[PDB]
Design a binder for this molecule. Sequence first.
Ligand code: NI
Length: 341
Amino acid sequence: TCPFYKKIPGTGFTVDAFQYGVVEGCTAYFLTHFHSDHYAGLSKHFTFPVYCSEITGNLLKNKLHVQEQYIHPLPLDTECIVNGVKVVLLDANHCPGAVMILFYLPNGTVILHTGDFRADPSMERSLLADQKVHMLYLDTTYCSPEYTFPSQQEVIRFAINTAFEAVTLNPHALVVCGTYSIGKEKVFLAIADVLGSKVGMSQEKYKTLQCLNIPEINSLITTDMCSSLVHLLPMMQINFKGLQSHLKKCGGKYNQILAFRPTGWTHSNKFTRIADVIPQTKGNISIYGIPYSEHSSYLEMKRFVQWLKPQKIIPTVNVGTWKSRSTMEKYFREWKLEAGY
Ligand code: NI
């Protein structure tokens, strides 16, 4: 059944709750972003109102074939009324189209649902600064102190410098980047830019990217693989067998592959820095795992919460085990005792 952490008290609203059939008492279904564990269940046969960002709306229309009459896009940073309740969509610094939602309940309670987010100090100067938030529905993906990772900027600097050096030493090397969802487009776009190439990809992935309102996108991507030396492939194909196979497909235009796997966290983060990352190599193929995260590190998450000072925190990730739930509640109490709220 729909879990309690997907329901907004005092409204008939749910958030990211499309896989339970008709939820008894739901008048509006919000969708924070276009990731499959969040949209799971949506299709052309859905006949209830969906509220979301413009970009998420483009993906629902073009990729899932949801009918236009049920898609309700809202602009960001704007007070809107939905079924008698004031709401605001805020940028979540996750993937394109991703939002946090502020609900202003008729009784005076204010609720923030973060969706999936990567907490940033810039959020401390949005509309959130303007009033008190009583309850917080929090992305707790990485809520443990072992989870450190570098800035997105640092990681893109490393990837750009690595690719540029490799291709300048060998003009017949191909760069491949893995993907299985929207998000992390900066990785392949930044590399293609330094090399003076467009990025080449399947027709399905090009269609997905043309939904995202990225400026000058027609100048940056293409379905012609031959004219491009940055290829995108399914994450599944980013291994030696898949990459050897792919190189055969290119008709001897290339003799070397340098590949990137933008992972979340991996336990080499606890020891190693970004400057010291090394690839796995077999033959003329090298594969780099780079820690490009679109979720809060532990310290980023802690700072945001200690700034916001909520009265109650509801986790939305890692909620399925008693050990995980108990651990998270310990951190929340530490944070509150240290900061004094
Ligand atoms: Ni997500």
